[PDB]
């Protein structure tokens, strides 16, 4: 007796799954084949235990028509095949209009557009041009945005976004993005004179290319410390200032076009 009530439970772009009801009998096991019906490719044929009533044939060709026979075995003897035909799905499509929404040193968030097909989530391969080890991440199907955490500051990343549907991964959408630079820290006022201030700070995590220091009188535009400190300096003497004047200092980082947030403070000459 052949199995009955054959039904396909899940069809992916690479697999097909089905249940059924075993014919009340002895159980030597089952045989199951899947042959391209309208083409020439494999010929997946897999055996199954005697107590089976479901199956999962994976690793099939995308967008392909398959004949599926489900044979019940009993000692060299075979029974009539429960049949059906399934056509695999076309692989999943990569996300569209992938743009960066913002970044905060160690994290970058992005938003993309979804095609209209059965999805089971996303995956993000974030690769830094600097570092030598990337961070892989997975996402949930119901969201169209995601902040990537765990990056370095001021580092440039090649971010690959993918779509997921079971063991099916789409081709990627590539996105160039970089991190915010971490502002210098602990601005300390070492010395003063009616015409100058000596300031020291903690260098950023990034591997900046120098700083720009700004000072402004209380009713006059901020000026840059002309000489512009080399990235190797961590202290600078601000000269040519007015006496008894309360100045505001801004120490900012640079990695060739990226101004870090500004490190601030005030002190009077």
UniProtKB/Swiss-Prot annotation:
Tissues expressing the protein: Expressed in the inner limiting membrane and around blood vessels in the retina (at protein level). Plasma FN (soluble dimeric form) is secreted by hepatocytes. Cellular FN (dimeric or cross-linked multimeric forms), made by fibroblasts, epithelial and other cell types, is deposited as fibrils in the extracellular matrix. Ugl-Y1, Ugl-Y2 and Ugl-Y3 are found in urine.
Coiled-coil region list: none
Purpose of the protein: Fibronectins bind cell surfaces and various compounds including collagen, fibrin, heparin, DNA, and actin. Fibronectins are involved in cell adhesion, cell motility, opsonization, wound healing, and maintenance of cell shape. Involved in osteoblast compaction through the fibronectin fibrillogenesis cell-mediated matrix assembly process, essential for osteoblast mineralization. Participates in the regulation of type I collagen deposition by osteoblasts. Acts as a ligand for the LILRB4 receptor, inhibiting FCGR1A/CD64-mediated monocyte activation. Secreted by contracting muscle, induces liver autophagy, a degradative pathway for nutrient mobilization and damage removal, and systemic insulin sensitization via hepatic ITGA5:ITGB1 integrin receptor signaling.
* Protein name, as recorded: Fibronectin
Q: Source species, please?
A: Homo sapiens (Human)
Q: What modifications follow translation?
A: Sulfated.
**Region entry Binds to FBLN1: which residue ranges?**
91-269
- Effect of altering residue 112 to R? In GFND2; reduced binding to heparin, endothelial cells and podocytes; impaired capability to induce stress-fiber formation
Region (Heparin-binding 2), start-end ranges: 1-269
Q: How does it assemble?
A: Mostly heterodimers or multimers of alternatively spliced variants, connected by 2 disulfide bonds near the carboxyl ends; to a lesser extent homodimers. Interacts with FBLN1, AMBP, TNR, LGALS3BP and COL13A1. Interacts with FBLN7. Interacts with COMP. Interacts (via type III repeats 9-14) with TNFAIP6 (via CUB domain); this interaction enhances fibronectin fibril assembly. TNFAIP6 may act as a bridging molecule between FN1 and THBS1. Interacts with TNR; the interaction inhibits cell adhesion and neurite outgrowth. Interacts with FST3 and MYOC. Interacts with SVEP1. (Microbial infection) Interacts with S.aureus FnbA.
Consequence of changing residue 161 to R: In GFND2; reduced binding to heparin, endothelial cells and podocytes; impaired capability to induce stress-fiber formation
Highest taxon of the source? Eukaryota
Tell me which disease this protein is linked to: Glomerulopathy with fibronectin deposits 2: Genetically heterogeneous autosomal dominant disorder characterized clinically by proteinuria, microscopic hematuria, and hypertension that leads to end-stage renal failure in the second to fifth decade of life. Spondylometaphyseal dysplasia, corner fracture type: An autosomal dominant form of spondylometaphyseal dysplasia, a group of short stature disorders distinguished by abnormalities in the vertebrae and the metaphyses of the tubular bones. SMDCF is characterized by flake-like, triangular, or curvilinear ossification centers at the edges of irregular metaphyses that simulate fractures. These corner fractures involve the distal tibia, the ulnar aspect of the distal radius, the proximal humerus, and the proximal femur.
């Amino acid at each position: 007796p052949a199995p009955t009530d054959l039904k396909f439970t899940q069809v992916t772009p690479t697999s097909l799954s089905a249940q059924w009801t075993p014919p009340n009998v002895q159980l030597t096991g089952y045989r199951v084949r899947v042959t391209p019906k309208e083409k020439t490719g494999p010929m997946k044929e897999i055996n199954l235990a005697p107590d089976s009533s479901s199956v999962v044939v994976s690793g099939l060709m995308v967008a392909t028509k398959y004949e599926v026979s489900v044979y019940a075995l009993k000692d060299t003897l075979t029974s009539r095949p429960a049949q059906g035909v399934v056509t695999t799905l076309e692989n999943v499509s990569p996300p569209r209009r992938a743009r960066v929404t913002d970044a905060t040193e160690t994290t970058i968030t992005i938003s993309w557009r979804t095609k209209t097909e059965t999805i089971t989530g996303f995956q993000v391969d974030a690769v830094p041009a600097n570092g030598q080890t990337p961070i892989q991440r997975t996402i949930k199907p119901d969201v169209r945005s995601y902040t990537i955490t765990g990056l370095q500051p001021g580092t440039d990343y090649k971010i690959y976004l993918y779509t997921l549907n079971d063991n099916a991964r789409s081709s990627p959408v590539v996105i160039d993005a970089s991190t915010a630079i971490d502002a210098p820290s602990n601005l300390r006022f070492l010395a003063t004179t009616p015409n100058s201030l000596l300031v020291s700070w903690q260098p950023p995590r990034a591997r900046i290319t120098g700083y720009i220091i700004k000072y402004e009188k209380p009713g006059s535009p901020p000026r840059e410390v002309v000489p512009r400190p080399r990235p190797g300096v961590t202290e600078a003497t601000i000269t040519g200032l007015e006496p008894g004047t309360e100045y505001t200092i801004y120490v900012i980082a640079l990695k060739n076009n990226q101004k870090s947030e500004p490190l601030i403070g005030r002190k009077k000459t």
